[PDB]
Write a protein that binds this ligand. Structure first.
Ligand SMILES: CC(C)(C)c1nc(-c2cccc(NS(=O)(=O)c3c(F)cccc3F)c2F)c(-c2ccnc(N)n2)s1
Ligand SMILES: [Cl-]
Length: 255
């Protein structure tokens, strides 16, 4: 049903690529983002794999999740989504250095906690959550998307990854903790470790978790506790997003 005829899609300039596909700004009844997959003439085992991915994205309707809009097969395999007018959270924290007040910081965390709560409720695991995947639409509304190398958000257990299935709900919770670290400190974790291979090594064996003493003076005390609980070493000792969301939903009212 969601099959959009291509000729309507005016493909524009290239935005870039990440963990999935190559992204372009486009037009389809207004501004849209167009994610090319670079698959020419799909084999039935690729068309079904494409429809399996579409089937997962189709299952998301939430104001904090990036709005899936359609998909094309001719001339190329592509996914059309809403266009976010703004900049990523990573961009605001480590590129622009935007002066967010604490009210705004906790707000961004709350919207992300709801989107993650929605995703987990629909049994969807992000697997690559990070501040670059938190798009601040109109510098107000969080839009989560972009479902190699980006280890600062990887949990310890994702370093095994050869026995069973290491990506879990708890692994998404850990990545959310790192986003909280960025929000409350203004920095990426492990600022003084100038070599990735040792970060991978340390976090993997577990002798390394971010320094919760870089947090800004006005960081709430419950936020400190929540960060520590999300960044706990063992999978099973991390809180689910229903508890995370509820904890933040109390902090915003106190603030
Ligand atoms: C810079 C980087 C990281 C390469 C980007 N990828 C997308 C992008 C574009 C389209 C889809 C998805 N994510 S997705 O493919 O996994 C997805 C859907 F295709 C549909 C619904 C939800 C969803 F997460 C994206 F991350 C970006 C993007 C998305 C929306 N608006 C803007 N301005 N940029 S940016
Ligand atoms: Cl539908």
């Amino acid at each position: 049903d969601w099959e959009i005829p291509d000729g309507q899609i005016t493909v524009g300039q290239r935005i870039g690529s990440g963990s999935f596909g190559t992204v372009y700004k486009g037009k389809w009844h207004g501004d849209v983002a167009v994610k090319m997959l670079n698959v020419t003439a799909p084999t039935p085992q690729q068309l079904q794999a494409f429809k399996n991915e579409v089937g997962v994205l189709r299952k998301t309707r939430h104001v904090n999740i990036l709005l899936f809009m359609g998909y094309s097969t001719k001339p190329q395999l592509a996914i059309v989504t809403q266009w976010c007018e703004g900049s990523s959270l990573y961009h605001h924290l480590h590129i622009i250095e935007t002066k967010f007040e604490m009210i705004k910081l906790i707000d961004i965390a709350r919207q992300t906690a709801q989107g993650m709560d929605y995703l987990h409720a629909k049994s969807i695991i992000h697997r690559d959550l990070k501040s670059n995947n938190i798009f601040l639409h109109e510098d107000l509304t969080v839009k989560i998307g972009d479902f190699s190398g980006s280890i600062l958000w990887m949990a310890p257990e994702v370093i095994r990854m050869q026995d069973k299935n290491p990506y879990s709900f708890q692994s998404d919770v850990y990545a959310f903790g790192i986003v909280l670290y960025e929000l409350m400190t203004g920095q990426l974790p492990y600022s003084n470790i100038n070599n990735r291979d040792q970060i991978i090594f340390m976090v993997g064996r577990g002798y390394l978790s971010p320094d919760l003493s870089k947090v800004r003076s006005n960081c709430p005390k419950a936020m400190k506790r929540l960060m520590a609980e999300c960044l706990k070493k063992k999978r099973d000792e991390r809180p689910l997003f229903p508890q995370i969301l509820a904890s933040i939903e109390l902090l915003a009212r106190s603030l």
